[PDB]
PDB file of C-alpha atoms and ligand atoms in Angstrom:
ATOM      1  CA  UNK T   3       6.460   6.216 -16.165  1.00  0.00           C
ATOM      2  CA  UNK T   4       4.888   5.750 -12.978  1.00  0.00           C
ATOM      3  CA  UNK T   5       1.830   7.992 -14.018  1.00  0.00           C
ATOM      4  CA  UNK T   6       1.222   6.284 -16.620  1.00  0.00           C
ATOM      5  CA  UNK T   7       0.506   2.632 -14.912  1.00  0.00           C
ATOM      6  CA  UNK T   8      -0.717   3.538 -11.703  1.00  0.00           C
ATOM      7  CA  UNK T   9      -4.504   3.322 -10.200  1.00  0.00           C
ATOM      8  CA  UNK T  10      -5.842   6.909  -8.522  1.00  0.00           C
ATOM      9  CA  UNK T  11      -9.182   4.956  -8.058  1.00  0.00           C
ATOM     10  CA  UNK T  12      -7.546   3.847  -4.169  1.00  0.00           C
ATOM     11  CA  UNK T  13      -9.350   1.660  -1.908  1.00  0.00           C
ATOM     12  CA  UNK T  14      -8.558   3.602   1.727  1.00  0.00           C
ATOM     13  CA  UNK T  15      -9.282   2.383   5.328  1.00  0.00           C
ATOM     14  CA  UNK T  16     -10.011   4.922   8.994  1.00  0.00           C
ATOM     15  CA  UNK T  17      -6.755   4.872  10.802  1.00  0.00           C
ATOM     16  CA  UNK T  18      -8.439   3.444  13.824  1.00  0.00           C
ATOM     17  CA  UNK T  19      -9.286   0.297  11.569  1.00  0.00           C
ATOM     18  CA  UNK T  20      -7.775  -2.837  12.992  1.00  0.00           C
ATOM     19  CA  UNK T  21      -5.956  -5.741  10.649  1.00  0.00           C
ATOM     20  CA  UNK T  22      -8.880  -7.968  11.545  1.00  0.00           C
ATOM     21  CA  UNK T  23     -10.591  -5.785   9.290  1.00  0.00           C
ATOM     22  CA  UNK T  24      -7.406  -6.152   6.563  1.00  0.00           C
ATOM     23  CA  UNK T  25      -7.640  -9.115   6.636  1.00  0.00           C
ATOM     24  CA  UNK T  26     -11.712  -9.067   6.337  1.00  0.00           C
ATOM     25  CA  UNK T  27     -11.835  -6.753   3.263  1.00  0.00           C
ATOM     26  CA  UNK T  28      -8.838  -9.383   1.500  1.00  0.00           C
ATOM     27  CA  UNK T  29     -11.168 -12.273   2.554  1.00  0.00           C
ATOM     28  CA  UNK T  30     -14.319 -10.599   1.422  1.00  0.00           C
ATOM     29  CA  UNK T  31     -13.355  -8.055  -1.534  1.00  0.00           C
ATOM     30  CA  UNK T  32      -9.968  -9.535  -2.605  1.00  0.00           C
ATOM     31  CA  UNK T  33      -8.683  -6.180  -0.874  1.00  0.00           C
ATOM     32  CA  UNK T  34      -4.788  -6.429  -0.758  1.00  0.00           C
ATOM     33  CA  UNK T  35      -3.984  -3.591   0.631  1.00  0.00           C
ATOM     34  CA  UNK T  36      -5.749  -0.384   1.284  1.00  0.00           C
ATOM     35  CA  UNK T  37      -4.657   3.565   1.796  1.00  0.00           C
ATOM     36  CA  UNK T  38      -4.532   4.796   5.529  1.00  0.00           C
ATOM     37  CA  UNK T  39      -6.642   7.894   6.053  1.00  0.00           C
ATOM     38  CA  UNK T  40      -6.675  10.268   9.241  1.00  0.00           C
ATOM     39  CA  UNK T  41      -9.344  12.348   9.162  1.00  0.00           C
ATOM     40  CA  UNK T  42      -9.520  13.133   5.361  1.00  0.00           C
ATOM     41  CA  UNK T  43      -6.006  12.742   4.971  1.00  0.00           C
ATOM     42  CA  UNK T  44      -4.156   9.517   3.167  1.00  0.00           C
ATOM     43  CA  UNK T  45      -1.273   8.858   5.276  1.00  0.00           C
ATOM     44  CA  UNK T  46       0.196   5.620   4.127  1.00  0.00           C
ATOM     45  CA  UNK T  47      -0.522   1.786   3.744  1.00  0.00           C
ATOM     46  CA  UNK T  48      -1.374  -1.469   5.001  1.00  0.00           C
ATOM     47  CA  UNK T  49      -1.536  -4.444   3.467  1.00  0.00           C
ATOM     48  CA  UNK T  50      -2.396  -8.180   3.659  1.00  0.00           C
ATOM     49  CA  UNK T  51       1.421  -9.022   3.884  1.00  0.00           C
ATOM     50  CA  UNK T  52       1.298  -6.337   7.218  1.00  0.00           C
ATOM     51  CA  UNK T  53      -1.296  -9.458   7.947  1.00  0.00           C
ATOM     52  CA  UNK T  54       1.034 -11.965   7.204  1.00  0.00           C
ATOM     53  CA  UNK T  55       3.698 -10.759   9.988  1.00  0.00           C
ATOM     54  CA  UNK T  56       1.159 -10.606  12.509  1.00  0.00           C
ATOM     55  CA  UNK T  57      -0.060 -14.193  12.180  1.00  0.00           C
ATOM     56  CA  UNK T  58       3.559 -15.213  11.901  1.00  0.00           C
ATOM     57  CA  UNK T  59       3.654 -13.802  15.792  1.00  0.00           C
ATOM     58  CA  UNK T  60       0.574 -14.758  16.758  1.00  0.00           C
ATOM     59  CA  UNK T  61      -0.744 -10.942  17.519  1.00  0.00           C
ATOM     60  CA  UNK T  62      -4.659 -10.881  17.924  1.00  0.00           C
ATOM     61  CA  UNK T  63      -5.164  -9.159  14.376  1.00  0.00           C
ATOM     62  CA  UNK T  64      -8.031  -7.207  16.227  1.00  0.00           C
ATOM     63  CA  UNK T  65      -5.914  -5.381  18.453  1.00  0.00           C
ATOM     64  CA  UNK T  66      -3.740  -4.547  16.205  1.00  0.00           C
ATOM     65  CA  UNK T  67      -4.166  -1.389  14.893  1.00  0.00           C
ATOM     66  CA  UNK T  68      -3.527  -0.162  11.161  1.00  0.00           C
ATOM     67  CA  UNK T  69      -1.510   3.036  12.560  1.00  0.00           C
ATOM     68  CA  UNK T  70       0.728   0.697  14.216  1.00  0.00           C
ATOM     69  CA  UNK T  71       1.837  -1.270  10.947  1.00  0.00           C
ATOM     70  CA  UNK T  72       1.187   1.025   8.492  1.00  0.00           C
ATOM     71  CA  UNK T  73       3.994   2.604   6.254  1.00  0.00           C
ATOM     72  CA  UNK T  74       4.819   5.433   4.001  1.00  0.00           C
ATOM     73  CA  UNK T  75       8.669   6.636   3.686  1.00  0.00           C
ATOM     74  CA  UNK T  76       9.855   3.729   2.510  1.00  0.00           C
ATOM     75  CA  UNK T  77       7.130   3.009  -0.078  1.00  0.00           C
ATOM     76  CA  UNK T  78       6.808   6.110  -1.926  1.00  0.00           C
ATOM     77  CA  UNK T  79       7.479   7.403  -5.342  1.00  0.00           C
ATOM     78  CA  UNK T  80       7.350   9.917  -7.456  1.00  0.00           C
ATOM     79  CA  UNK T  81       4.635   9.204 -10.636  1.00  0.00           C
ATOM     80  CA  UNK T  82       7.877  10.665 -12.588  1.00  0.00           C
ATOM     81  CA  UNK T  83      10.068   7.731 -11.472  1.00  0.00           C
ATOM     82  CA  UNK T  84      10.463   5.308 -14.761  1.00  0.00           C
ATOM     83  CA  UNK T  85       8.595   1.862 -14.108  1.00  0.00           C
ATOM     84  CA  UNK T  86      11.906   0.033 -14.061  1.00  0.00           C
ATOM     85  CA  UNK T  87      12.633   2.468 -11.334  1.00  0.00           C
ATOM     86  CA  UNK T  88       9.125   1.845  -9.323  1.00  0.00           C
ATOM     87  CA  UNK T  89      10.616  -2.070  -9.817  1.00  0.00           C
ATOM     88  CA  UNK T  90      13.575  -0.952  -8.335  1.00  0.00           C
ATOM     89  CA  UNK T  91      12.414   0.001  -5.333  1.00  0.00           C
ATOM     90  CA  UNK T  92       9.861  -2.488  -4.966  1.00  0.00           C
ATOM     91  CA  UNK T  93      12.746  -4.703  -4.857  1.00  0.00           C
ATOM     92  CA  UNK T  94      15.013  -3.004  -2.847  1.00  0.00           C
ATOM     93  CA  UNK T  95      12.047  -2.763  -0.175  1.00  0.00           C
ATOM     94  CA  UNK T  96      10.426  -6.263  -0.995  1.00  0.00           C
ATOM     95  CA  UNK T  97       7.212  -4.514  -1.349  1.00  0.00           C
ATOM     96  CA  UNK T  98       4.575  -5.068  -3.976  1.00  0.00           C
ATOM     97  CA  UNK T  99       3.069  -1.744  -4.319  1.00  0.00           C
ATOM     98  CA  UNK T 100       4.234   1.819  -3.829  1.00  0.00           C
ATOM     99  CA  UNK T 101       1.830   5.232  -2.974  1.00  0.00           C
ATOM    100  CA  UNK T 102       2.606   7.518  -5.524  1.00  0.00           C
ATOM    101  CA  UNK T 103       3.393  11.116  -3.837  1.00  0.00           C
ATOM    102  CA  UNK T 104       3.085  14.271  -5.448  1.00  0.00           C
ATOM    103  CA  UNK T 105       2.873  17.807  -4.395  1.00  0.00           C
ATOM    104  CA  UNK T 106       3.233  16.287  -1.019  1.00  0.00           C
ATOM    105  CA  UNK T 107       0.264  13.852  -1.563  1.00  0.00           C
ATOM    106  CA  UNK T 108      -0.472  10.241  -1.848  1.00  0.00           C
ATOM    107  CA  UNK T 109      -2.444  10.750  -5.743  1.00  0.00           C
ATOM    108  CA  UNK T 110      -2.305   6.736  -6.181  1.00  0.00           C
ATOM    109  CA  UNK T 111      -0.994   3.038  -5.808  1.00  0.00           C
ATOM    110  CA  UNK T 112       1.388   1.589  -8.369  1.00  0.00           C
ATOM    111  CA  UNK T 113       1.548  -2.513  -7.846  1.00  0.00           C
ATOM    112  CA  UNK T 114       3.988  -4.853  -9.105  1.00  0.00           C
ATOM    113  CA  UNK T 115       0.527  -6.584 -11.072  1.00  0.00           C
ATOM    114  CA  UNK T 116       0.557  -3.329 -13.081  1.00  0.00           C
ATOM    115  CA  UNK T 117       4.405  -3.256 -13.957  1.00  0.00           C
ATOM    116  CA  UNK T 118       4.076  -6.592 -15.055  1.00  0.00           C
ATOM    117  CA  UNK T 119       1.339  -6.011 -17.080  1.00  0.00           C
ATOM    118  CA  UNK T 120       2.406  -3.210 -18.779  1.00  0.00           C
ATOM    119  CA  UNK T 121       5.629  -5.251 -19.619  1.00  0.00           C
ATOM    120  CA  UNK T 122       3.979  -7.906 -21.474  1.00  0.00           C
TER     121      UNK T 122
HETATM  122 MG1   MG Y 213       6.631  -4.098   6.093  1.00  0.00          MG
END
C-alpha cells in the first residue's frame, strides 16, 4: 500500500516562495518538487513540471508565486490506497507524485520513482 512506499522525510517550501526558487532548488539540490507550507501548515505542492508550464508561456518564474500554481485536491491519496491504485491516479491526473493525506494531513509524498521501484 501507499504507506508502505511513500517518503514522510518531505522537502517543503514558504508559500510566498516564487518558482524561480523551484526551479533553483531542482537546479541546485535535484529538488523536483517540494511541499507548500503556510505558516506551519503543508498545504499542497509544486513541482518542477509547475516550472515547465510557466516557461512554456514565458511567465517571469520570479513573479510567479508557488500559491498560485500549487495543487492539492487532485493529487491526494489516502496511504491505504493500493500502489496500483496511487498509479491509477497518477495516471488519470498525469502527475508523478501524490501527498499522502491522513487524518486531514499531508503525512508524505508517494512518486511514481517509488512505485516503480517497489515493482521491480
Ligand atoms: Mg498541474
Amino acid at each position: 500500500r501507499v504507506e508502505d512506499v511513500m517518503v514522510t522525510d518531505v522537502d517543503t517550501i514558504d508559500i510566498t516562495a516564487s518558482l524561480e526558487d523551484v526551479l533553483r532548488n531542482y537546479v541546485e539540490n535535484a529538488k523536483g518538487s517540494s511541499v507548500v507550507v503556510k505558516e506551519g501548515v503543508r498545504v499542497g505542492i509544486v513541482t518542477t513540471w509547475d516550472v515547465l508550464e510557466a516557461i512554456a508561456e514565458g511567465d517571469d518564474l520570479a513573479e510567479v508565486k508557488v500559491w498560485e500554481v500549487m495543487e492539492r485536491d487532485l493529487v491526494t491519496i489516502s496511504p491505504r490506497a493500493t500502489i496500483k491504485e496511487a498509479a491509477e491516479k497518477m495516471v488519470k491526473n498525469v502527475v508523478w507524485r501524490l501527498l499522502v493525506e491522513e487524518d486531514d494531513e499531508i503525512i508524505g509524498v508517494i512518486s511514481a520513482t517509488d512505485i516503480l521501484r517497489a515493482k521491480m
